[PDB]
Amino acid sequence: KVKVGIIGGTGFDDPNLFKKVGVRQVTTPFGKPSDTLVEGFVGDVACVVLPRHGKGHLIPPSEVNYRANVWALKDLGCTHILATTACGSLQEDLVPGDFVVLNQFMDKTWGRENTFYGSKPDSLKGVLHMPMAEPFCERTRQILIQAARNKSINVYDKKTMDKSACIHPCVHAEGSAVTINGPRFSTRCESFIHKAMGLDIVNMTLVPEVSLAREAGLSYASIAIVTDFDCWKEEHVCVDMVLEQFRKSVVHVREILLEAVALIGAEDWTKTIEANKALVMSSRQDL
Amino acid sequence: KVKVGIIGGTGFDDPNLFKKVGVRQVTTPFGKPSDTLVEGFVGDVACVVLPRHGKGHLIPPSEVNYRANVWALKDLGCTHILATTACGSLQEDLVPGDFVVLNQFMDKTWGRENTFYGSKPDSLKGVLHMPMAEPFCERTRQILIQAARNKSINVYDKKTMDKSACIHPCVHAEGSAVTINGPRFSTRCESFIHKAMGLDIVNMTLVPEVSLAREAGLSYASIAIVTDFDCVDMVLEQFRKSVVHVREILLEAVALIGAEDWTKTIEANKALVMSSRQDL
Amino acid sequence: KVKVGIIGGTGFDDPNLFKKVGVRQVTTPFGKPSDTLVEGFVGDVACVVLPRHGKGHLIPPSEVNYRANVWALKDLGCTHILATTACGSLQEDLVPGDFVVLNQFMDKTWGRENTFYGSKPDSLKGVLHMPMAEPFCERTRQILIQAARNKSINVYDKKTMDKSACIHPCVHAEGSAVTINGPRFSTRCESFIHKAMGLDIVNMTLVPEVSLAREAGLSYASIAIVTDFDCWKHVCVDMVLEQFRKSVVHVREILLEAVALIGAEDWTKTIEANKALVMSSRQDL
C-alpha cells in the first residue's frame, strides 16, 4: 500500500494535522532526525509528520539533517513525501498568500550532506549519479494541484491562463526555487540576479531534501508558501499583518495536505514505486 | 560613546594608523582572531586595528576566522567596523587606483563559518535570519565617502553624474562585489559571466565579514582598492599610493564618526538582531 | 627530463596504456591517492597513470583526493598531466561521440580541498593566489589537438571553421566546462542557466584538479569525452555504452600520441615558467 510522510517547514513546527495515534522517536544510519515523528491516519491512509526545524524551530536550514529525515521516513515505510516551505517571491505574479507547487530549482546550497552514497564510512557504499532534470514526482505534483481544486483554492497556470486571470490567493501550477544556504537573506544584488535568471521564489530548505527523497526511491512533492520578509522596508503592524496572512496560508496548506493524502491513497502506485527503485539501481556507477 | 574597529586587508598587514597605546592578545568563543588587536586613539576617538590576514599575511581568505575577528572587536566595545579590501575590476569605469565604497555584493564563498547562531553546541542558541538587502551600514558608508571628499579625492556617483564625470582616480559612491572563495583568481570564463551579471569588482574577503558584523550589531562599511592582479612594477607603486589614500580616508572617517551621535543607530543595530531571531 | 602523468576518468578505471614497469603505492602530506600509481614508458617517454576514481570506481567526484593525486604525480617526477573526463553537452554543436580539448571553465564545486597552501597544519606554509584566466597549459592543449589530427580524427575549431564544417565525431579545439559538485546531475533549470551562460559541457571532476596542477608547477590539459546521460528521456543505454566504448578507444590513441608529441619537444623554459608562476603568486613572501 501507500504511506505519506509530511515534512512541515515554518508554520508546521508543531503539527496537528490529524488526531495523532502516538509520537515516535527513530534513529537512522545518518543521525537523529530533526524531532520525533507524529504517527496517525488520514482516513485509511497511514501518515507520518516530521517538523523540519523541530519543535521550537531551533534548527537552521543549513544544519537540518536532511539525510536522517528522509531515511527515517523511508524506514517507516513511507512511499511519498509531501513537504512545505515558506518562501519569498521573485516575480510580480507571486504575492504573499500564494502557494507554488514547485517543479524546478537552482541549487545554491553548500556544506550540507546531500547524498546517501559515497566512499566515507558514514555513507552507504557506492557512487550514485541520480538524474534530476525534472526533480519532483510529477504524479504527486498534480495531486497537490488537484487537492487545491477540491478545496476551492484558485489554481493559476501561466502557460494556460492570462496574467489578468491570476486570482489571489492562488496555487501556481509550476515554479522554480533558488535555494540559498542561509541563514541570511539575499542582498538586493543577489535577488536581482536570481530574478534575471527567471527564478520564481527563494527559500533555504528544498535542497538536498528533494534530491535525497529521490535517492531513497520516494515520490516527493513540495508546496511552497509565499510570505513577506521585508517588513524592515509601522514594523509591529507589518509583522502582525504578515503573520496573520501566513496563518491563513497555513490553514489552506493543511487543507491541501489532508486532501492530497487521501488522493494518494485512492490510486495505485505499483509501477511508479517500482520505477522509483529501478531509477536508484540504474544510477549506480560503481556497479 | 563610539569605538571604531579597523580590519586591514592586503596592504594593511602592519599598519601605523596611530601610536599604539596597548597591544592586546585575546581569543573568542569561536577561536583565535587573525592577530593581536592594537588599541589607540585617533584624536579623542578610540580605535582598534586588526590585520585580516595577520602579520606577514599568512592566513588566506577562506581560512580567516571572520567570526573571531568580529567577536573580538565586539568584545572590546567597538561600535563600528571599517574594513579595506584589494579587488580586481570587472567593469571599464572601475580602473586600477580607484576606490569603491561598496553597497552590494554577490556571495560565491563556501566552507566558511558565516554565522554566530545555530543549533550546534559551539554556536549561540537560536535561528537568526538577518535581512541583507542593503548589507552595509548606510550612515557609515556616507562617512567614508565624505572622508574621501575631505581628503581631496574625486567621488563619482553614476546615479547622478555622467560617465564623463568619472575622473580617475575616484571613489565610486556605490558598487557591487562578487566575493569568490579563492585562493585562485577567476578564469576568463568566470570573469565574463560575473561581468555580464553587472558586478563591479571581485574580491575574496567581504563575505562573511559584512554578514557577521551585522549579526554582532555593529555598523560595518568597506572601502575597496581597485588594483590589477593580471606591468608589475607600476601596479605595485599604484597600489602603494592607493594604500596611502585609504589610510587618509580611514583616519578622516574615524574623526567624522566620533563627531556625531550614534545612540539611535546603535540601538537600531541591536534591535535588528533581536527581530531577526526566528526561534523567539 | 619530461615525464607525463595521466589521470584517467570514467572509462579508464583500469587502463592498459603500456607495459607496467612498476606499480607504486605512495603517500602524500595530503593523504592517499585514488589508487596505486603505475610507472612505465610510451616509447622513450616516462609515463605515470592513475585512475581518478580508483579501481572499481568507488570514489565519487566530490571525495576524490585531488591534492594527493596531483602531489603524488609531482613527487614521481611528472612535468605534465593529461586528464580525461566524461561529460554531458550543453550546446547543439557538441554531440555524443565528440571530444573537447578544454580551455575554460566555471567552478560550481564546494567542500573540496582545492589548494596545497594555507595556515593549517595539513598545508604548505604560505598564501598562494594563482592566476587562472587561461587555466590550462596552452602548449599541452595544442599537443592534444595535434594528436587528434595525427590519429585521423576530425578537429573542429569554431573560431576558424564554419558550423557546416563541423563533422561528427570531431575534437572541439576549444570549450568551456561547468564543473558541478555532484553527485546528482543538474535540473533542467540549472542546465538552461548554464547553457544561457555560454558553457559548452558539464562535468564533475575538472576542479580543483586543474587548479592544483598549476599550483604544483605542472602543465595540465584535459580532453573531455561527450557522452549521453539523458537516456531517461533501453536501446539508448546499449547504444550510448557502445558509443562511449569507441570514444575511449580514440582517447587512448590521442593520449598515447600526445605523450610521444610531448617528448619530441624541449620544455626547459615552459617548466621554468610554471615554477616561476608559483613563486610569483606567493602573497606571504
Numbering used by the authors:
A (entry chain C): 3 to 235, 238 to 291
B (entry chain F): 3 to 232, 242 to 291
C (entry chain A): 3 to 235, 240 to 291
Article sentences:
Because the S. mansoni genome does not codify an adenosine phosphorylase, one alternative to fulfilling this activity is 5´-deoxy-5´-methylthioadenosine phosphorylase (E.C. 2.4.2.28) (MTAP). The observed overall fold of SmMTAP is similar to that of members from NP-1 family of low-molecular weight purine nucleoside phosphorylases (PNP), which consist of a central β-sheet distorted barrel surrounded by α-helices, as observed in other MTAPs from human and bacteria. Furthermore, a comparison of the KM levels reveals that S. mansoni MTAP can use adenosine with the same efficiency as MTA, which is one fundamental difference between S. mansoni and its host and reveals a potential target for schistosomiasis drug development.
No significant differences were observed between double and single mutants. Even in the double mutant structures, the position of sulphate/phosphate was conserved. A disulphide bond between residues C233 and C242 was observed in the APO structures of S12T, N87T and S12T/N87T mutants. SmMTAP structures displaying this SS bond also have the gate loop locked in open form. In general, residues 229–242, which comprise the catalytic residue D230 and the gate loop, are disordered in subunits without ligands. The double mutant appears to be conservative with respect to these parameters and shows a small increase in the kcat/KM parameter (1.6X), thus indicating a conservative role of this pair of residues in MTA catalysis.
